[PDB]
Every structure is written in C-alpha cells, then in structure tokens.
Scaffold this motif. Structure first.
Motif, PDB file in Angstrom:
ATOM      1  N   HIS A  71       0.854  -1.188   0.000  1.00  0.00           N
ATOM      2  CA  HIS A  71       0.000   0.000   0.000  1.00  0.00           C
ATOM      3  C   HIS A  71       0.892   1.241   0.000  1.00  0.00           C
ATOM      4  O   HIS A  71       0.978   1.942   0.987  1.00  0.00           O
ATOM      5  N   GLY A  72       1.585   1.473  -1.112  1.00  0.00           N
ATOM      6  CA  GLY A  72       2.500   2.593  -1.245  1.00  0.00           C
ATOM      7  C   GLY A  72       3.918   2.130  -1.512  1.00  0.00           C
ATOM      8  O   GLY A  72       4.613   2.695  -2.366  1.00  0.00           O
ATOM      9  N   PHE A  73       4.339   1.093  -0.777  1.00  0.00           N
ATOM     10  CA  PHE A  73       5.618   0.428  -1.019  1.00  0.00           C
ATOM     11  C   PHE A  73       5.577  -0.278  -2.379  1.00  0.00           C
ATOM     12  O   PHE A  73       4.679  -1.057  -2.637  1.00  0.00           O
ATOM     13  N   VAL A  74       6.558   0.006  -3.239  1.00  0.00           N
ATOM     14  CA  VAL A  74       6.713  -0.707  -4.500  1.00  0.00           C
ATOM     15  C   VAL A  74       7.972  -1.568  -4.411  1.00  0.00           C
ATOM     16  O   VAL A  74       8.982  -1.162  -3.837  1.00  0.00           O
ATOM     17  N   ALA A  75       7.868  -2.760  -5.003  1.00  0.00           N
ATOM     18  CA  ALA A  75       8.931  -3.734  -5.137  1.00  0.00           C
ATOM     19  C   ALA A  75      10.019  -3.174  -6.050  1.00  0.00           C
ATOM     20  O   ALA A  75       9.723  -2.559  -7.082  1.00  0.00           O
ATOM     21  N   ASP A  76      11.276  -3.364  -5.632  1.00  0.00           N
ATOM     22  CA  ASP A  76      12.451  -3.017  -6.440  1.00  0.00           C
ATOM     23  C   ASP A  76      12.811  -4.239  -7.306  1.00  0.00           C
ATOM     24  O   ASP A  76      13.186  -5.309  -6.781  1.00  0.00           O
TER      25      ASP A  76
ATOM     26  N   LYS B 236      18.689  -4.619  -2.487  1.00  0.00           N
ATOM     27  CA  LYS B 236      18.091  -5.261  -3.650  1.00  0.00           C
ATOM     28  C   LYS B 236      17.069  -6.283  -3.153  1.00  0.00           C
ATOM     29  O   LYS B 236      17.147  -6.692  -1.987  1.00  0.00           O
ATOM     30  N   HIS B 237      16.152  -6.679  -4.050  1.00  0.00           N
ATOM     31  CA  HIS B 237      15.129  -7.721  -3.825  1.00  0.00           C
ATOM     32  C   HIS B 237      14.106  -7.300  -2.760  1.00  0.00           C
ATOM     33  O   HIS B 237      13.297  -8.121  -2.339  1.00  0.00           O
ATOM     34  N   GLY B 238      14.091  -6.011  -2.389  1.00  0.00           N
ATOM     35  CA  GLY B 238      13.172  -5.464  -1.382  1.00  0.00           C
ATOM     36  C   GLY B 238      12.181  -4.477  -1.978  1.00  0.00           C
ATOM     37  O   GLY B 238      11.794  -4.587  -3.160  1.00  0.00           O
ATOM     38  N   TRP B 239      11.777  -3.503  -1.159  1.00  0.00           N
ATOM     39  CA  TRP B 239      10.743  -2.534  -1.519  1.00  0.00           C
ATOM     40  C   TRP B 239      11.184  -1.115  -1.105  1.00  0.00           C
ATOM     41  O   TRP B 239      11.867  -0.979  -0.092  1.00  0.00           O
ATOM     42  N   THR B 240      10.752  -0.084  -1.857  1.00  0.00           N
ATOM     43  CA  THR B 240      11.048   1.340  -1.568  1.00  0.00           C
ATOM     44  C   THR B 240       9.750   2.120  -1.314  1.00  0.00           C
ATOM     45  O   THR B 240       8.714   1.786  -1.862  1.00  0.00           O
ATOM     46  N   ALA B 241       9.828   3.189  -0.508  1.00  0.00           N
ATOM     47  CA  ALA B 241       8.680   4.118  -0.286  1.00  0.00           C
ATOM     48  C   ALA B 241       9.168   5.537   0.040  1.00  0.00           C
ATOM     49  O   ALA B 241      10.259   5.724   0.559  1.00  0.00           O
TER      50      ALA B 241
ATOM     51  N   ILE C 153       3.167  -1.671   3.817  1.00  0.00           N
ATOM     52  CA  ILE C 153       3.302  -3.044   3.287  1.00  0.00           C
ATOM     53  C   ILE C 153       2.996  -4.000   4.445  1.00  0.00           C
ATOM     54  O   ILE C 153       3.323  -3.696   5.585  1.00  0.00           O
ATOM     55  N   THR C 154       2.362  -5.141   4.146  1.00  0.00           N
ATOM     56  CA  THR C 154       2.048  -6.151   5.152  1.00  0.00           C
ATOM     57  C   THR C 154       2.633  -7.498   4.708  1.00  0.00           C
ATOM     58  O   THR C 154       2.563  -7.860   3.546  1.00  0.00           O
ATOM     59  N   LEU C 155       3.226  -8.223   5.661  1.00  0.00           N
ATOM     60  CA  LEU C 155       3.836  -9.510   5.430  1.00  0.00           C
ATOM     61  C   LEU C 155       3.328 -10.489   6.491  1.00  0.00           C
ATOM     62  O   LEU C 155       3.067 -10.097   7.644  1.00  0.00           O
TER      63      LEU C 155
END
Ligand SMILES: OC[C@H]1O[C@@H](O[C@H]2[C@H](O)[C@H](O)[C@H](O[C@H]3[C@H](O)[C@H](O)[C@H](O[C@H]4[C@H](O)[C@H](O)[C@H](O)O[C@@H]4CO)O[C@@H]3CO)O[C@@H]2CO)[C@@H](O)[C@@H](O)[C@@H]1O
Length: 368
Positions: free
Chosen positions: A244-249, A261-266, A273-275
């Motif tokens: 929800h705002g966080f986009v995958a890199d 790398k392999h994470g998310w940016t905001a 983001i929820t996990l």
C-alpha cells in the motif's frame, strides 16, 4: 615484531573434517573454499580483492595442494552479523556446496547472549548442511581497545568442538605493547590494510599448516534456545505480501554486497506493506542512509501499534550506508505473525527513499 602464533589457536577442536578435506585435496578432488563474515571477510580495506585475508587463505589451499582445483567463495557482507548470516547462509553459502567454511563475525556481533544464540543458529546450520563442511571460526579484534565478541563465540566453538583462531591473542598483544603501530596494519583500528590482511591470513595458515603436518564427535544438544537456526528472509518474491505505497524493487543485483536489492522502496507518509512471517522471532532489514535526510518508518507486529518500533533511516554514523537488522520480537509464540511497515515521517528534501530489504522469521530446528 614477533607474533606468538601458537596463541592464535583459541580452540583446537575436532580436526576430523578439516583433515578429511586435506585428504580429498591430496586425491585431486575439486574443493570449495568459502568464507562467511562481515567487512573484513568481504576484503575491506585491502587495495585489491586478491590481497584480502580470504584470498590469501584460498592461495594457501592452492599452493599446498597443487594437484587439486579450488574454488573461491567470498560470502562476506560489510556491517552485518551472524543474525543475517544464518538467514542468508542457504543462498550465499550452502547453495555453492562448501567443503571449507570460515565464520568471521567476532567484530560485528555484540558480545551478548542474543548473538551467542544467533551464532549458534548459524553454526548448527552450516555444520549439519549437506556437504558437512570443515568449519574454522575466526575471531578478529578491535585494535582501538582489544575488544571482540569472542567470549560468546568461543563458548559455541568449545560446544561443537570447532577449531577457532583469534587475532585478539596474537596481533592485538603486539599492538598494545607498542611493537606494532596501529597504522602499519589498520587505517581505522578495525579494517586491516594489505599488511594487516596478510598478517591475519598468516595466523590462519599457521594453524592450517599445523593440521597438515599431523571419527567426529557426537552432535550436542544446543547450548542456547537456538531459536534462529531456522531463519527465513521474506523479500519481494514472497506471496502473502500486500503493498500500500511500497513498490517492489525489480532492479538486478550485481553481487551479495549490492545489498539494497530484492526489497521494496517508499517515499510518501502513510506508505505501507504487510507480510505474513512465521516464527517465534521477527527481525527487519532496512537501509540506514549516509545521505540525509531520509524517511522514518515504524514496524507493527500483530496489530500492536501501541508498541511499534521506529525504523529511522537517518544514519547517525558517517562511514557509509548500513544494512541494519533490528530484532523486533524475540521468543514470542511460534506462528504466522502479521507484520506491517509504514512511513511515519518524510521530508521534501529526502535524499533517498526508505529501503525495506527483508523481514526475517525465525524459530528453532528440533534437535534429535
Ligand atoms: O558493528 C560493530 C562496529 O561497527 C562499526 O561500523 C563499521 C561496520 O561494522 C563495517 O565494518 C564498516 O565497513 C565499511 C568500511 O569501513 C568501508 O566504508 C567500506 O567501503 C567499501 C565501499 O562500500 C565500496 O564497496 C567500495 O567499492 O569499497 C570500499 C572498501 O574499500 O564499506 C564497509 C562496509 O561494507 O565500517 C564501519 C566503521 O568502520 C561501528 O559502528 C562501531 O561503532 C561498532 O562497534
């Protein structure tokens, strides 16, 4: 100077595995020489990769056993602990089928019971892995004060009868007594230079030479609760993640040291983001930026926002970016936890987005 090289052997341990590898080398078998550790392992602060202690130890294998073909596997990442170690072991190390494994986290881990428990996790995982690698523990030392986490890591050495060499009882004694000026071997009292990396390697290869010129013990129950031996990184490939705002890199990772790398940016307040993360332990990996200012996030476990933890990407140190890892929940209940990360503070002049690298779920592996 003269180093007392015999003082390097912090633990002799069982040499069965290590001698078995030397016998394979004599038989002309291909062998995988691996190193798992922090900044010193990666090669800071050598002038070339070939002049770091790891490459020196690798060349020792080559020169002593010319009949065998050796592969160099350097799984060092700067500014990281055995806690990250145990989570990344499978990908960065065990998946390259190591036969020799040096573990080097004694100036990255704090000397606390937490890191005795994570280090144990790491050790149990590596030793009982598919290729049953020969494990050597290496203890670096802080040359400013003579410190390391060897008190915690030594207990694990003796528990599993692992060989262990230490610079704390070889190199630091020389330095503290004036026989070595710090700047001959390290510019910043932590990272060796060329001379220092050669010296560190020389303490290792001394032991290795001793072993050469010369069936494994029962596998003990864990000394600690050992609740990190099973550590799972949840990164941007995990299903069960809702942004929800966080986009995958999606960008390509050059090597393991390219660690954001392999994470998310905001970038925007309220981005989340929820996990779903399974374990009794929850820890989170994010960037602390040397480029200020940067966002601040909080992480919530099981909807308990009243007790959220602040993840401040505004680093208060100046040497470079840090791959931070915070322990958020420890020895909770082992189950699927809900984890949320949301940006709580941003600035018009933020020099970088918040980078969420991973969330790690950990629990014990049953001993038999
Ligand atoms: O955590 C314990 C201890 O840590 C101290 O911070 C350390 C940190 O643990 C880590 O060892 C760090 O290593 C740095 C190094 O100092 C250089 O910045 C190095 O650089 C490389 C750069 O990133 C590029 O890869 C470039 O191509 O090559 C450079 C090397 O030639 O990057 C390393 C990280 O990978 O150093 C810091 C400080 O020395 C302190 O936090 C201390 O308080 C604490 O007890």
């Amino acid at each position: 100077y003269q180093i007392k090289y015999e003082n390097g052997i912090a633990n002799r341990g069982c040499l069965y595995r290590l001698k078995k590898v030397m016998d394979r080398a004599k038989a002309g078998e291909a062998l995988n020489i691996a190193f798992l550790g922090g900044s010193i392992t990666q090669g800071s602060l050598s002038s070339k990769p070939e002049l770091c202690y790891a490459y020196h130890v690798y060349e020792w294998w080559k020169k002593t056993f010319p009949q065998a073909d050796f592969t160099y596997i350097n799984a060092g990442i700067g500014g990281t602990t055995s806690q990250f170690g145990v989570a990344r072991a499978e990908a960065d190390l065990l998946s390259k089928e190591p036969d020799f494994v040096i573990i080097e986290f004694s100036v990255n881990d704090d000397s606390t019971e937490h890191f005795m428990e994570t280090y144990e996790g790491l050790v149990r995982k590596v030793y009982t892995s598919k290729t049953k690698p020969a494990v050597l523990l290496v203890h670096n030392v802080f040359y400013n004060n003579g410190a390391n986490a060897q008190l915690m890591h030594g207990r694990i050495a003796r528990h599993y009868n692992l060989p262990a060499v230490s610079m704390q009882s070889t190199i630091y004694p020389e330095v503290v007594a004036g026989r070595i000026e710090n700047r001959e071997i390290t510019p910043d009292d932590l990272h060796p230079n060329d001379a220092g990396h050669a010296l560190v390697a020389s303490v290792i290869t001394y032991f290795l030479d001793k072993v050469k010129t010369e069936s494994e013990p029962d596998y003990p129950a864990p000394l600690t609760k050992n609740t990190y031996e099973k550590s799972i990184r949840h990164q941007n490939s995990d299903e069960n993640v809702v942004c929800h705002g966080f986009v995958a890199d999606t960008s390509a990772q050059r090597d393991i040291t390219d660690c954001f790398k392999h994470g998310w940016t905001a970038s925007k307040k309220g981005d989340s983001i929820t996990l779903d993360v399974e374990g009794c332990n929850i820890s989170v990996q994010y960037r602390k930026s040397v480029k200020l200012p940067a966002p601040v996030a909080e992480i919530i476990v099981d909807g308990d926002a009243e007790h959220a933890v602040r993840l401040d990407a505004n680093f208060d140190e100046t040497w470079g970016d840090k791959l931070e890892l915070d322990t958020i929940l420890e020895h909770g209940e082992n189950k699927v936890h809900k984890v949320e990360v949301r940006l709580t503070e941003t600035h018009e002049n933020d020099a970088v987005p918040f980078y969420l690298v991973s969330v790690i779920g950990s629990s014990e592996k049953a001993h038999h």
